Amino acid sequence: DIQMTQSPSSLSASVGDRVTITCRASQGITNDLRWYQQKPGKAPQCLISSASRLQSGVSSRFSGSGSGTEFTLTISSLQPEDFATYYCLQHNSYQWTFGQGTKVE
Amino acid sequence: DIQMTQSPSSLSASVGDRVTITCRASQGITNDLRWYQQKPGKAPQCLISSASRLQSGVSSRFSGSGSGTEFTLTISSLQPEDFATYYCLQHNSYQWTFGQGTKVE
Amino acid sequence: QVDADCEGDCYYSGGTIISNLPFQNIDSRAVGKCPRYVKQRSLLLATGMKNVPEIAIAGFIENGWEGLIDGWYGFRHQNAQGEGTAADYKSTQSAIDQITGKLNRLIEKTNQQFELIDNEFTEVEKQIGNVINWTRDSITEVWSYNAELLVAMENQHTIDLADSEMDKLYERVKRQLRENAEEDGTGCFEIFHKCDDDCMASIRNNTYDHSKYREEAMQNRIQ
Amino acid sequence: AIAGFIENGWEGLIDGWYGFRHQNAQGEGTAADYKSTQSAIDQITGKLNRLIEKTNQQFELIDNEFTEVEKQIGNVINWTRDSITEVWSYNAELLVAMENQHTIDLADSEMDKLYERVKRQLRENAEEDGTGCFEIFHKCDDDCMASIRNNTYDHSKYREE
Amino acid sequence: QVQLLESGPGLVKPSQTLSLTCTVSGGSVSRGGYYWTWIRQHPGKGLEWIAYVTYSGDTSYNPSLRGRVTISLETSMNQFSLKVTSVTVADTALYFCARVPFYYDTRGVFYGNAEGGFEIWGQGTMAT
Amino acid sequence: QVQLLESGPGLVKPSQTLSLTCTVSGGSVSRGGYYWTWIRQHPGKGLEWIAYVTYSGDTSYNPSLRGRVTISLETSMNQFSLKVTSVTVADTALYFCARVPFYYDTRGVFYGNAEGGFEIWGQGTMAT
Amino acid sequence: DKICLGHHAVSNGTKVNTLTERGVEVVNATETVERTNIPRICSKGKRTVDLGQCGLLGTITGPPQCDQFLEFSADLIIERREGSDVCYPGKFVN
Ligand SMILES: *[C@@H]1O[C@H](CO)[C@@H](O[C@@H]2O[C@H](CO)[C@@H](O)[C@H](O)[C@H]2NC(C)=O)[C@H](O)[C@H]1NC(C)=O
Ligand SMILES: *[C@@H]1O[C@H](CO)[C@@H](O[C@@H]2O[C@H](CO)[C@@H](O)[C@H](O)[C@H]2NC(C)=O)[C@H](O)[C@H]1NC(C)=O
Ligand SMILES: *[C@@H]1O[C@H](CO)[C@@H](O[C@@H]2O[C@H](CO)[C@@H](O)[C@H](O)[C@H]2NC(C)=O)[C@H](O)[C@H]1NC(C)=O
Ligand SMILES: *[C@@H]1O[C@H](CO)[C@@H](O[C@@H]2O[C@H](CO)[C@@H](O)[C@H](O)[C@H]2NC(C)=O)[C@H](O)[C@H]1NC(C)=O
Ligand SMILES: *[C@@H]1O[C@H](CO)[C@@H](O[C@@H]2O[C@H](CO)[C@@H](O)[C@H](O)[C@H]2NC(C)=O)[C@H](O)[C@H]1NC(C)=O
Ligand SMILES: *[C@@H]1O[C@H](CO)[C@@H](O[C@@H]2O[C@H](CO)[C@@H](O)[C@H](O)[C@H]2NC(C)=O)[C@H](O)[C@H]1NC(C)=O
């Protein structure tokens, strides 16, 4: 039940501003984090898998980093089509847990 | 005294027919089987050393295979000069034993 | 004929080479961003590991398991509860990453643009034509040798890479079993202490504790 | 009186490339391993077949040694030939260095594989004496040494003592 | 072009069983090396992982409610189904099915086809 | 051009010793890495292995008759001899000597000369 | 109990050539030589001039066969075997 706690829940930023977002895990999880972006009323799609990679086809402006209990995703430039919700999934153990929720505006 | 049993003893075939010949060993002889061909009234000469590959100076139509207790030699095309007798020798242990005898006609 | 639906940058007298590979054997005289012409018809690059066919419970030294589908390297355990198998994600992912690194490095073709220097339809003067033909044969002899050498190097390095990853995995499971288990010949470990499927999943990841079972396992080894 | 691979190499070994020297109460005797030597010879002959074969491309005369070719195309030909032989000389030096290094590493890897094999046979009966040897604790004769030469050594028969 | 289309009733009586089948329209479901997962979200809340199953047979159901949900892999009709018994109001949510790969292959060294390495999600089927 | 020519009396009295010497006409017999073997066959029967000797000293006479045959390697006159005592009628057969290599080398990496890797058999000397 | 380690094996296999051995069996292989071509010319987003019955040298001199391509403009120019650069008998130096 590694507790995935995301902070802060609500973000508001202008177009072209860097969004620094944090995903927090309790245990010493090792190299196992998938980042999910869903549009409202739309199926989620993965961005950063392994915490340092990008599904082929995902734009290179999405960039993730972090290791251990600290995990960060960076967005270089915001877009009008980037109005969405960003999630982090852990897959190290036999259990998978999501975060509470982080929304950009 | 790994028993070397060859079967069948007498073979008759036409020119150009494939000859499938079997050499049988009792123990788990591992990757050791020299094949000897001897014209009648003539010194024997080796064809297949190490049971899967040819000797230099021997025509490529001779081909041997098999592993473990089962060992096979294949002849792709018979020749008028191939009227001879085919043996198999084992050399895995400290003892060397021949087979009973296999003759082509 | 010409159509505007497809896109390629390499052209010859019979059509268009459209796909990116290191080399080609369609034509020696090709125009544009083209793969290098080689004399060899077939050149296979090892994208997988060395294959030994399968012929109580086996190990890496004896053969390879055909039933393993979750990955390239797997953990087969025989226990009192039953027999089950899994796969190691770390060694398989590292092998796949290094093979994909090899593939990205080689698959990319050149950006140098080459022109026509010979008129196939009408012949060039015979002196400069012979000079051009000699230069092209020397260049394709260099590129064919480089292609054969590169294929041999990457195949040998892939096989040695897979063997090294297996050795690293085997040493890791040896480093986890300090004095509780011992090496059974064919690539397996003979577990002396009674430990369940939770133990097998604990030895699958790097969370196995040696001190919890050390006394009874050492008593089993000495006796 | 007996030393190992780590310390040096034996000049008295003639039956093969890798050998088994054993000191026993009956006496001192040596042999050779056919599997490791045969594998090394097969891989070296594979290297030799691959390299020794020359080309099938046919090259013509492009320059008359007796009568000089026009200077401009002659200088172009000379520059191209010097560039080509520079490429081939670099490739020759690189290939020789690669195959020499790979042969040395190949022999070292075959020795390591043999040494690990004899270690895997001696489960808990013998232990590692520094210079590449194994110090046998149990009393076992030349039949034991020939049983450890092939892969038929039984650990359970001598494990207790 | 693998599409993970979902089928379901859409109207669930309380304290009854619910069958949610995600049909795989593509190459195969018996390929191996994939987590076949069920993911649900109530609107205004977050996603909640339910269960994952593989072709090899490994199945860890959510620690949240192991007894209520059962996942099974059905090769013959190319689908994997999630069954939740004793459905309450809080069980009603929008459901998703996903093919989560074991490894990350951009060029198909393990999966083989260079499109199997992608993560494909279903369109979604809301259940009440 | 190594030739394994054989020499012998050809007429053996019963219950007496027989000396069969296979002279090596070539480079050397002290090269090492070869089994120096004696092979015999009665007509109408099969070949029967007798003994093998090496330059290092490894000698394994046939399990069939360890006492009767004594194979010795003689470097000075470049030959290896087989001696069979108490010769009976069944001991009378056609005899062969062979140089069986330890390894398979097509290109002479271990033997050195690329002709030593071959298996050379003697012409044969019948003994009564 | 017993834990065993092992790798995957595939039945059919593929033959590859290595540095020290030929015909080594691997589980999969890819080809580094393109032997396949698209029989027709691919040109998308690049201008293309097809000189049927016209030559490149005829675009300067202008035979009746080259009237359309007197002021042509392209990023890819295709010559054909049927193209002639002359109408009166003749040729061009260099
Ligand atoms: C490493 O593997 C062990 C063995 O399974 C894991 O320990 C068990 O994990 C499951 C699932 O989380 C729990 O239900 C068990 O209670 C755990 N057993 C014990 C004794 O703690 C462990 O969680 C794994 N660790 C990681 C980081 O994956
Ligand atoms: C492996 O080596 C052992 C040790 O020499 C061999 O066992 C002996 O073999 C000789 C010759 O065949 C016999 O005279 C002895 O009686 C054997 N001793 C025992 C204890 O069995 C064994 O045959 C070898 N195995 C192989 C396959 O070569
Ligand atoms: C240079 O080599 C090319 C081939 O690469 C030669 O072109 C061929 O010429 C013959 C006539 O000699 C024709 O039948 C072929 O159809 C031509 N092939 C191609 C692909 O065009 C060319 O003749 C050579 N030049 C010289 C001066 O020998
Ligand atoms: C191109 O190089 C060759 C040598 O490879 C030159 O040939 C030599 O020319 C000198 C006179 O300048 C003679 O004395 C030598 O005997 C020639 N050697 C051979 C092997 O023929 C040739 O002159 C060079 N061409 C140019 C234009 O410099
Ligand atoms: C691994 O093997 C599979 C087959 O089991 C390959 O799949 C086919 O490979 C050929 C040759 O590369 C292609 O022409 C086919 O289109 C492939 N079929 C598909 C889509 O699976 C696969 O390419 C191999 N992967 C690698 C490169 O290791
Ligand atoms: C191994 O060394 C031996 C000498 O100890 C080489 O034998 C001679 O080598 C030279 C040069 O290759 C030849 O010209 C002689 O004809 C060889 N003599 C004999 C009788 O063998 C041998 O070639 C070397 N082997 C290799 C291939 O490295």
Helix/sheet category of chain C: alpha+beta
Helix content of chain A: under 10%
Largest sheet of chain A: 4 strands, antiparallel
Number of strands of chain C: 10
**Helix and strand pattern of chain C:** EEEEEEEEHHEEHH
Sheet with the most strands of chain C?
2 strands, antiparallel
Instruction: Write out the strand line-up for the largest beta sheet of chain C, numbering strands in chain order.
Output: 2-3
Morphology call of chain A: globular
Provide the list of bound ligands, each named once.
a molecule of 2 linked components (NAG-NAG)
Coarse structural class of chain A: mainly beta
Beta-strand share of residues of chain C: 15-25%
Give me the side-by-side strand order of the main sheet of chain A: 1-2-6-5
Distance between the termini of chain C: 84 Å
Oligomer kind: part of a larger assembly
Helix content of chain C: 25-40%
Order of helices and strands of chain A: EEEEEEEE
Task: Offer a few descriptive terms.
part of a larger assembly; 7 chains; A: 105 residues; mainly beta; globular; C: 223 residues; alpha+beta; two-stranded antiparallel ribbon; 4 helices; 39% helix; 15% strand; binds a molecule of 2 linked components (NAG-NAG); immune system/viral protein; Group 2; influenza; Fab; immune system
Explain this structure to me?
This is part of a larger assembly, with 2 copies of chain A (105 residues), 3 copies of chain C and 2 copies of chain E (128 residues). Chain A is mainly beta and 105 residues long. Chain A has no helices and 8 strands. In chain A, the strands form 2 sheets. Chain A has a 4-stranded antiparallel sheet with strand order 1-2-6-5, with no helix packed on it. In chain A, strands 4-3-7-8 form a 4-stranded antiparallel sheet, with no helix packed on it. Chain C is α+β, with helices and mostly antiparallel strands and 223 residues long. In chain C, 39% of the residues lie in helices and 15% in strands. Chain C has 4 helices and 10 strands. Chain C has a two-stranded antiparallel sheet with strand order 2-3. In chain C, strands 4-5 form a two-stranded parallel ribbon. Chain C starts with a strand and ends with a helix. Chain E is 0% helix and 43% strand. Chain E has no helices and 10 strands. With 128 residues, chain E is an all-beta fold. In chain E, strand 4 and strand 5 form a beta hairpin. In chain E, the strands form 2 sheets. In chain E, strands 3, 4, 5, 8, 9 and 10 form a 6-stranded antiparallel sheet that branches. Chain E has a 4-stranded antiparallel sheet with strand order 1-2-7-6, with no helix packed on it. Chain E starts with a strand and ends with a strand. Chains in contact: A-E, B-F, C-D, C-E, C-G, D-F, D-G. The interface between C and G is large, with 90 and 47 residues. Strand 7 (73-78) of chain C pairs antiparallel with strand 1 of chain G, so a sheet runs across the interface. The complex binds a molecule of 2 linked components (NAG-NAG) (6 copies). A molecule of 2 linked components (NAG-NAG) sits between chains D (143, 146-147, 150, 152) and B (92-95).
